[PDB]
Amino acid sequence: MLTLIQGKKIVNHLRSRLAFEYNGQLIKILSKNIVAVGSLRREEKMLNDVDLLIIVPEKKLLKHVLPNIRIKGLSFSVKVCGERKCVLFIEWEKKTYQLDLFTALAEEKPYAIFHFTGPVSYLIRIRAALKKKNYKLNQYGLFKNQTLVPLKITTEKELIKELGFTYRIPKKRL
């Protein structure tokens, strides 16, 4: 549908035009909390849809960016995807595409980026892998016998060593 260039051009502008409506007020967001997922992180050439990751550093703003969040006067449709995911239908050049954005906590930063950069297949392969050790890896942390355990990392390469795994690339899969 869209090429690597397209998705890059839009997101580049879109991450500088993004904002959210808090308490009725308008609050712009900075690209610092906006990462382009999909062909951009998978190093592909032509995607089918564009994914986007937005991290929030507050235990408030994390859920207050959820009510109203969007661009300034554009053609989009805000719908709910799954349980916690969100999807928007934007229109460009008289065409309509699907935008899937994901908002998470700063503490989940390494967990989320890794999750969205690697192949789902590998992720489960890792899920069970951890269960075998009596561990459940979720986006909110690590569950040990129903006991949630927090993380002590914030880097993509720190998370892998903290987990005891090697960094993988979607390009090769698993």
UniProtKB/Swiss-Prot annotation:
CC cofactor note: In the presence of magnesium, pol X shows a strong preference for the ssDNA gaps having one and two nucleotides.
Cofactor: Mg(2+)
Principal localisation: virion
Keyword 4Fe-4S: no
Record annotation: effect of changing H115F: Slower dG:dGTP misincorporation
Record-level GO cellular component terms: virion component
SUPFAM superfamilies: Nucleotidyltransferase
The protein's enzyme class: transferase
Impact upon substituting H115E: 36x decreased dG:dGTP misincorporation
Reactions accelerated catalytically: DNA(n) + a 2'-deoxyribonucleoside 5'-triphosphate = DNA(n+1) + diphosphate
Signal peptide stretch: none
Residue span of region Involved in ssDNA binding: 42-51
Top-level lineage group: Viruses
Binding site residues for Mg(2+): D49, D51, D100
Effect annotated for changing R127A: Slower dG:dGTP misincorporation
Stabilizes dGTP in a syn conformation to overcome the Watson-Crick base pairing constraint (site feature) positions: H115
Subcellular location per the Swiss-Prot or TrEMBL entry: Virion
A single GO BP: double-strand break repair via nonhomologous end joining
Enzyme Commission number(s) of this protein: 2.7.7.7
Domain notes: Small DNA polymerase formed from only a palm and a C-terminal subdomain. Unlike other polymerases, binds DNA via the helix alphaE. The total DNA-binding site of pol X is composed of two DNA-binding subsites.
Record's miscellaneous remark: Consistent with its intracellular location, ASFV encodes its own replicative DNA polymerase and three base excision repair enzymes: a class II AP endonuclease, the repair polymerase Pol X, and an ATP-dependent DNA ligase.
Family, similarity comment: Belongs to the DNA polymerase type-X family.
Protein name: Repair DNA polymerase X
